[PDB]
């Protein structure tokens, strides 16, 4: 395919993943942007992947698609089949990755706003619980804070699947070789350069300083296996959130917890969603 993918592949071989996300981020600024929510090119309509039972005031899960360039609609397919007959599971797309190619959000809040406007429409009046894995975790918490403040529609709760927020990213950096290798592994097609740029831009948004904590109760799903090597001498490699309302450990590592062991993740979510209603 494109040259940005050839550079990306070379940077993973050569254990320079970190360096190269900076080039992706810096190059993304010369893509076309959209500056206001309605100026988004993609129809951000959510997509129903599971239905709940025909009852009544229960909450719907909203999956927030992650930053991975090789991500798309299929991200939540394995996970969602375990919410069938349990909860509505809608997956919202992320602005910057669709069909030509798409306008990049000028800044993070513009994209979160465009997302919240589409979730509110499709949610109706159901209470809404947000869900993200990895970079999607960070994203979901920001959308939860952006729904609370900017739109006065605070979510019923947030599920964070293995988040490494800016305080606690040391195990993510150490393992960045595997993270990069995992992106390539999990490829249905050659990653487009348009999406690699999109990925780099959101990587920059989320790396940055971010102020508010969202008042919604947080469920923190952590992996059990480390992604790579890690001397016990060096501390806890597990994902971290500050005052989890509930902590749940599922089998596998940063990657396999949503592939092989996604039913354990849905089991934690179901148990938790009832304990809060």
Ligand X SMILES: *C(=O)[C@H](C)C(=O)[C@H](C)[C@@H](O)[C@@H](C)C[C@@H](C)C(=O)CC[C@@H](C)[C@H](O)CC
- Given the rule CB under 8 A, which residues bind a second copy? 2-4, 7-8, 10-11, 14, 16, 19-20, 22-23, 26-27, 29-32, 193-194, 197
Q: Tell me which residue of 205, 179, 210 sits closest to 25, measured CA to CA.
A: 205
Based on CB atoms, which residue is closest to a second copy, 21 or 112?
Answer: 21
Whole-angstrom Cα distance, residue 239 to residue 63? 19
Q: Which positions touch ligand X (CB under 6 A)?
A: 21, 66-68, 134-135, 164, 169, 172, 179, 182-183, 199, 202-203, 206-207, 254
| 67 binds, options ligand X, a second copy, none, Cβ within 5 to 8 A by partner type | ligand X
Smallest gap from Cβ 54 to ligand X, in A, equals 34
Based on CB atoms, which residue is closest to a second copy, 19 or 242?
Answer: 19
Smallest gap from Cβ 154 to ligand X, in A, equals 24
Smallest gap from Cβ 275 to a second copy, in A, equals 48
What is the side-by-side order of every strand in the sheet holding 128-133?
A: 47-50, 89-92, 60-64, 128-133, 157-161, 218-222, 246-249
Q: Tell me which residue of 227, 233, 240, 229 sits closest to 168, measured CA to CA.
A: 240
Smallest gap from Cβ 105 to a second copy, in A, equals 16
Based on CB atoms, which residue is closest to ligand X, 66 or 98?
Answer: 66
| 78 binds, options a second copy, ligand X, none, Cβ within 5 to 8 A by partner type | none
Strand partners, 104: 33
- Extract the tokens encoding 48: 């129903």
Whole-angstrom Cα distance, residue 14 to residue 8? 10
Decide if 268 contacts 248 (C-beta within 8 A): yes
């Amino acid at each position: 395919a494109g040259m940005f993918r050839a550079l990306f592949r070379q940077a993973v071989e050569d254990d320079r993943y970190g360096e190269f996300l900076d080039v992706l981020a810096e190059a993304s600024a010369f893509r076309p942007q959209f500056a206001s929510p309605e100026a988004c090119s993609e129809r951000l309509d959510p997509v129903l992947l599971a239905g709940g039972p025909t009852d009544e005031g229960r909450a719907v899960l909203v999956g927030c698609t992650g930053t991975a360039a090789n991500g798309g609609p299929h991200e939540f397919l394995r996970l969602s089949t375990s919410f069938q007959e349990e909860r509505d599971f809608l997956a919202v797309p992320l602005p910057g990755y669709g069909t030509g190619t798409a306008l990049l959000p000028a800044d993070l809040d513009t994209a979160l706003d465009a997302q919240a406007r589409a979730i509110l429409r499709a949610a109706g009046d159901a209470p809404v619980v947000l869900l993200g894995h990895a970079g999607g975790a960070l994203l979901a918490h920001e959308l939860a804070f952006r729904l609370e403040r900017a739109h006065g529609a605070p979510p019923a709760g947030i599920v964070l699947v293995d988040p490494y927020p800016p305080g606690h990213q040391e195990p993510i950096e150490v393992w960045s070789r595997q993270l990069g290798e995992g992106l390539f592994a999990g490829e249905l097609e050659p990653m487009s350069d348009a999406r690699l740029l999109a990925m780099g831009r959101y990587a920059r948004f989320l790396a940055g300083p971010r102020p508010g904590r969202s008042s919604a109760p947080v469920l923190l799903v952590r992996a059990s296996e480390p992604l790579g090597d890690w001397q016990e001498e060096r501390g806890d490699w597990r994902a971290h959130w500050d005052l989890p309302h509930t902590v749940a450990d599922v089998p596998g590592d940063h990657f396999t917890m949503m592939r092989d062991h996604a039913p354990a993740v849905a089991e934690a979510v179901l148990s938790w969603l009832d304990a809060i209603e």
